[PDB]
From a paper:
Gas vesicles are gas-filled nanocompartments that allow a diverse group of bacteria and archaea to control their buoyancy. GVs have therefore evolved as rigid, thin-walled structures composed of a single protein unit that typically polymerizes into large cylindrical shells closed off by conical tips. The ∼7 kDa primary GV protein GvpA forms the core of the GV shell and the cone-shaped tips. Here, we report the 3.2 Å cryo-EM structure of the gas vesicle shell made from the structural protein GvpA that self-assembles into hollow helical cylinders closed off by cone-shaped tips.
We expressed and purified Bacillus megaterium GVs that form narrow tubes most suitable for cryo-EM analysis. We used a combination of two- and three-dimensional (2D and 3D) classification techniques to select 4% of the small GV subset corresponding to 35.6 nm diameter and used helical reconstruction to obtain a cryo-EM density of 3.2 Å resolution. The cylindrical shell is constructed from thousands of GvpA2 monomers polymerized side by side into ribs spiraling into a left-handed helix with a helical pitch of 48.8 Å and −3.87° helical twist, resulting in 92.93 GvpA2 units per helical turn. Contrary to postulated models, GvpA monomers and not antiparallel dimers form the repeating units of the helical assembly. The carboxyl-terminal residues Asp67-Ile88 are flexible and not resolved in our structure. The central β-hairpin, tilted at −36° relative to the long axis of the cylinder, forms the core of the GV ribs. Helix α2 folds back onto the hairpin, and helix α1 forms a bridge across the ∼16 Å gap separating adjacent ribs. The inner wall of the GV shell forms a continuous hydrophobic surface consisting of a dense pattern of hydrophobic residues located on the luminal side of the β-hairpin and helix α1. We located pores in the GV shell formed by slit-like openings between α1 helices of adjacent GpvA2 monomers. GvpA2 monomers are held together tightly by lateral connections along the GV ribs formed by an extensive hydrogen-bonding network between the β strand backbones.
Numbering used by the authors:
A (entry chain N), B (entry chain N), C (entry chain N), D (entry chain N), E (entry chain N): 2 to 66
Write the structure that this text describes.
Amino acid sequence: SIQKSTNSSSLAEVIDRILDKGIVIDAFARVSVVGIEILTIEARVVIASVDTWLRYAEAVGLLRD
Amino acid sequence: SIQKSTNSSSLAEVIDRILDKGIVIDAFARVSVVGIEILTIEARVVIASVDTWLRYAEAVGLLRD
Amino acid sequence: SIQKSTNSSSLAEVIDRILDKGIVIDAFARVSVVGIEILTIEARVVIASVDTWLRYAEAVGLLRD
Amino acid sequence: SIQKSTNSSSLAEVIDRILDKGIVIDAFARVSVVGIEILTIEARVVIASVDTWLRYAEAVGLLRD
Amino acid sequence: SIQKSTNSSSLAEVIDRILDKGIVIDAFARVSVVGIEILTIEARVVIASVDTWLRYAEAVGLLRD
């Protein structure tokens, strides 16, 4: 191709650049009464391409040893 | 590309620059009566890219030893 | 880029400069009758980027020893 | 940048300059009858950036020894 | 900057100059009948920046010895 005065790029390349960084959303909350932990919530979400989800899974320990 | 008189940058690069710094929102409250801790709340939220959520997780201790 | 006669900066850089200083909001109150501490409240909130929330957490003692 | 005839500065820098000095609001009251301290109130509030809230916390004694 | 014929200064600098002097408001009253101190009130309020509230607290004795 040829060089241009503008940097702007394609939608499919925005998607690819998002997925090979990935996203983690992570949260917890706890509610206690008189010292007893009467309610608790924990949640996590991960989104990525395969080659980066393997990075996550190999560090956390979901692949075979 | 070529140099310009203005610095302004793309939306996908704002998103990437936010996620590789990450965000932590952290809070607790306690209500006590006669010296007994009759109610308590604690919460935390984390948002990041995978490579920076691993920074958090390795310092706090969520990865295998 | 090139130098200009004005200093003004981008919204994403205001956000980044806030989060790498962080914010702490901290309060307590106590109500006592005849010498007995019949009611008490304590609360704290913290907001930061990951690299500065780790500063807080390492000084207060939330990371593994 | 270049020098100017006026000193005026940005809103984000006012906020930063407030938070790295911090604010303490501190009060108590006591009501006594026949020599017995039948009612009492105490309250405190602190606001700062992380690096200055640590100054407060290290002098008052909220960090690990 | 450059020198001018007038001394006037910014609102954020008025606030800073107030808080690093601080304010103390202090009062008590006592009502006695036949020689018995049947009612009494005492109150205090303090406002400052952190570095000057520590001056108060170190002289009165609220910091660890």
